[PDB]
Paper text:
mTORC1 is one of the most important regulators to control cell growth and proliferation. Deregulation of mTORC1 has been found in many human diseases, especially in cancers and mTORC1 inhibitors have been clinically used for the treatment of organ transplantation and solid tumors. mTORC1 regulates cell growth primarily by phosphorylating a large number of proteins, including the eukaryotic initiation factor 4E (eIF4E) binding protein 1 (4EBP1) and p70-S6 Kinase 1 (S6K1). In response to multiple growth factors, energy status, and stress pathways, Tuberous Sclerosis Complex 1/2 (TSC1/2) complex serves as a negative regulator of mTORC1 and functions as a GTPase-activating protein (GAP) to inactivate the small GTPase Ras homolog Rheb, which binds to and activates mTORC1. Here we report the cryo-EM structure of mTORC1 at 4.4 Å resolution.
Using a Titan Krios electron microscope equipped with a direct electron detector, we collected about 500,000 particle images of the mTORC1 and reconstructed the complex at an average resolution of 4.4 Å and the central portion was further refined to 4.0 Å resolution using a local mask. The complex adopts a 2-fold symmetry with the central core primarily formed by two mTOR molecules. mLST8 is located on the distal convex along the short axis and protrudes out of the rhomboid architecture. Each Raptor binds to two mTOR molecules and extends towards the distal convex along the long axis of the rhomboid with the WD40 repeats domain located on the apical side. The C-terminal region of mTOR protein forms a compact core domain (designated Core), in which a “C”-shaped α-solenoid (FAT) wraps around the kinase domain from which the FRB domain protrudes out. The N-terminus of mTOR protein adopts a spiral (~1.3-turn) right-hand super-helix comprising of 16 HEAT repeat (designated N-HEAT). The middle region adopts extended HEAT repeat (designated M-HEAT) bridging the N-HEAT and the Core domain of mTOR. The dimerization of mTOR protein in the complex is mediated by the inter-molecular interaction between the N-HEAT region from one mTOR and the M-HEAT region from the other one. Structural comparison of mTORC1 with FRB-FKBP12 shows that upon binding to FRB, FKBP12 would be in close proximity to kinase domain of mTOR and therefore lead to steric hindrance for substrate entry into the catalytic cavity of mTORC1.
Author numbering:
A (entry chain A): 613 to 918
B (entry chain b): 78 to 169, 186 to 221, 256 to 267, 340 to 438, 441 to 548, 584 to 758, 778 to 814, 878 to 904, ...
C (entry chain a): 1123 to 1222
The structure:
Amino acid sequence: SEHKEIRMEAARTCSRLLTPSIHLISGHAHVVSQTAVQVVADVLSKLLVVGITDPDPDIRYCVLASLDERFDAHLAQAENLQALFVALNDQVFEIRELAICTVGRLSSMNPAFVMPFLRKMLIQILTELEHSGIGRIKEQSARMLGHLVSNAPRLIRPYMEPILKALILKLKDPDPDPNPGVINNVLATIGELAQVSGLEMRKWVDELFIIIMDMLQDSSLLAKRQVALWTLGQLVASTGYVVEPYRKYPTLLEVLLNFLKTEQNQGTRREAIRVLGLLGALDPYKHKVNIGMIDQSRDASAVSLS
Amino acid sequence: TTPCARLECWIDPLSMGPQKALETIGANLQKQYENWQPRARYKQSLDPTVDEVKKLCTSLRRNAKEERVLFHYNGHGVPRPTVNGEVWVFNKMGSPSIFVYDCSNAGLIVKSFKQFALQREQELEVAAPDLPADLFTSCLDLLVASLFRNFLLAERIMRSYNCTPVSSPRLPPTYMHAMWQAWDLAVDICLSQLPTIIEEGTAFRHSPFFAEQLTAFQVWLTMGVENRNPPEQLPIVLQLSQVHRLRALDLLGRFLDLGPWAVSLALSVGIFPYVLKLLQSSARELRPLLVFIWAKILAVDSSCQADLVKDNGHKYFLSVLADPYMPAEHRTMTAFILAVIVNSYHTIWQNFDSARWCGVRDSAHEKLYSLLSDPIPEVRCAAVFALGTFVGNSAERTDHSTTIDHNVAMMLAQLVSDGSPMVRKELVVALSHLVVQYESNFCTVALQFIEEEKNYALPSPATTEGGSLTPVRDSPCTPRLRSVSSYGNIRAVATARSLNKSLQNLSLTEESGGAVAFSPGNILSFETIDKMRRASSYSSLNSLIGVSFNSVYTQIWRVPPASSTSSSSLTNDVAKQPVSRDLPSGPHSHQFPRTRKMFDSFISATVQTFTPCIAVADKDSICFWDWEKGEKLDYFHPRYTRVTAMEYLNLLLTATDDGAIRVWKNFADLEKNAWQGLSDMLPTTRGAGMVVDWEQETGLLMSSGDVRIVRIWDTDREMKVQDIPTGADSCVTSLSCDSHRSLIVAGLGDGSIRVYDRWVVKASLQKRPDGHIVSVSVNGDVRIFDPRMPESVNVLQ
Amino acid sequence: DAPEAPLPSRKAALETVDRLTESLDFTDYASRIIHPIVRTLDQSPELRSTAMDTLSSLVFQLGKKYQIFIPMVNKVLVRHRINHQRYDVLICRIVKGYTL
């Protein structure tokens, strides 16, 4: 196991210019726990790498991340990476984002360096990481974040008015992605009123993007608990309607759950009456295994058939 | 003063007239100013003259007191009213501060100053003179009143507006107004600092202190709402600038929403995150989450200290920064708020840890005279030692110690009380940390002939001061000549008798520092008493030593274990078996347990290795008679070569008295047992090498000599002189390596020891006055070393 | 990237500067400001002196982003051959503004 890389030291350290990707696609399996791998985790990130050859010599030290001894080198790795996000490299934007996810994350500089990528937004999904990417870190110190956060919705909420869409969906994905941040979302929950309206008034476009409106309504409802008892029956109504236009309903699956995880339960089948039939309807029709699946949970988690 | 200083006021209704409640608003200012204070002259509507009068009244009002002075204005239909003169003829510790409220003229007014100053600066010179400094003019729809006027009052009041205004209040909702008083006690305390962050953020270095000035300067920054109008009203100041920005600014934003909940009803809260959430990761960077930052924080910590807070965790986090010092310690004093607040609490116990930890390290910053803080520590710092705990107070007690030894503000009587408690625990700690500390607590006495009460421990510590450790440390030698400062007055008289007693008690620490230190004025372990034995070798496990004796009876001593004589006159050799206690001698052999001879120019040096007895035989063919066989496999070929010593892992060494030191390639003698043959024959040292060091785990050479110098040698590819020791005035018997470390450990016919560093520099030197060191011993990892001298051997650690 | 009309490419990049001078500029937008830095390398050297000024106008207000963003732009104008001036002057200035 050991000698596999032991000579490859000189090799991986030395050139072979186009290949050392595969040098460093290795190790990466495995170990060789001696302190050279420290410096090996270093100098090949000190060259560093150039011209789209970059992504893994990023991923690597992310996979090569370790601790605790020399704390410089640890976030010194990060230091580098942090800088490296910007430089074109459109997945290598993502990819180093996609990494880390644990650990160390902190240095007050960093959030100020973390944030701007949330402030990219381009490309959209790049941001969508750091939200969750801070989703934890949010709750280390909201000090920087919670407000840096609070900006974002305060930045984001206004985006509900401005025409359509391509952003109004680029509202959607960033809506929950902070929800790994809990408390802030709690202490506001006017995202209800905004979005509660967002679905109602129609018909604006194809609006195909709507479906992801709902996902957030859902994941929110988790942190939303009996607080969320507000506005419901409408939702139960509206969605209960929304169940029967404009299909695929992957959400109403996940959607209706969490409502009942916020617990209007058995009387619901009065308010909305036919939901039984309405489900009893769907069940044979759709395949969409989840839809096959979730109606159960829908049913199941709802009720108790009376 | 209380309230601070003199202030000016004006209002523009129009021109020369009163008004309903226009009277009333003026006081509200003075009130608000008293809420910020001071001697305030209200006016209304005046034609310029009536104004001009009271300026001179305040120009009379004696501000050499005031810490500042103010000139307010407000909006009249553009009253031009002495663009220059009254202003400029009243012009540049009661420091003047000017205030402007304009559509335009504000800057112009400011612009005017400099311009008029440009005159009233330059044109004064040829008159050989108004000096602009400490004279500043601060600059200024549906819901306003007068913004920049309200701004400073009203600091938060205005803030609540830019809250309600607008888009954010969707989230926090909702508005109403007012009420909410004692929960608001924090918002100020917050918004107090919330700006100051940006301040320490942007300050550089123009800054506070002086209060009401900064109080404005703070409230100035509330102008960043400025948002109203595409002329976002852009106050101008030249005593900056960001506004905007300043994350705390973006931060206070939801620090409001923390309050917008509880205000809805019922209060209830209470609490709120801000100070807390700011407090927490202040440790983060404080630990290692910052690269220099610049502390990013400390400003916050200051006001944070003032409350019961959280006060500890702050004061805790304080010492954290005090740990990250020295580098940021200045920045602490930049903020200095310790000097403010740390001194501001002389009121600690649990805190005494931090009060030490913060304050000690603070007090450590070296320094500022405590002044009355010295009586406070004479209370507080003294009462800390009451528990005799902890070592957390070990040197922490000694914080205040050198202060009395620093300068005299007594430091004598208030110290006398401590003078009792100080020396008391001094011997009770018996730890050089608080002791070498308490050495300063001792030093705290200054001159101050005190009492036998003082003279009581004078001997008592001096005893432990004899004890110390490595008492021959030249550190004592200087520390000896230290108190000899008091002794320049000798030989007389009274305690001078008592002085000489404590004086003579310390023996002498002599070189190497003393070798330098002497002219400026101009552990020693075991010592056996018997006739001088030539070479001495301990049994490994047992402290029983062989000592080959000049009295021919080679003695065993477990530090008498036994003598032995199979030999005559000088017995110059003992080498114990590397495993057994079996020792050779010269060339009789013994085993200290059997304590008798095994088997017998004479061979004065032999050492067990392989299993060589490594010895250079004077038959001139060096004979190592291998103790198993007692047979010499190498006898090879014009003197008695000075050395046969196995180079540890690999080899041997031979110096020759002709001057040629010959490194051994002994391989074919070791491979048989090139029997004896020279690797490097290098006459440099004119004669017999007094010591050769074949490095323990490496191959360096050495040549010691009685040449009154030494040469370190590097023998790898070939022997070459590494560096040279020197400074010997007498015959240097030998040296050695430190086992793992590099210490040339040398000794001389003076009885003194030279510990020399790999510069070939003797760093430490043990000296004995009466001896001549021809012999030494060493214990490598754990260390107890047996030296020798003319009376008899002296072991030392 | 505009359609290929070169006028906006400058003129847009100007109205920026206009506000890049004025209030509320950087942090909320950073990459989106640095992204077009590349668009200067690609399209007409027209865009240089505008890029000179766009980027410059930034350098004034916020220096955080400035330093970052040191190296990126260092390589930027290499391909675009500029390596000058006032922007660099600012760079010198504000690096010195860090020494100051």
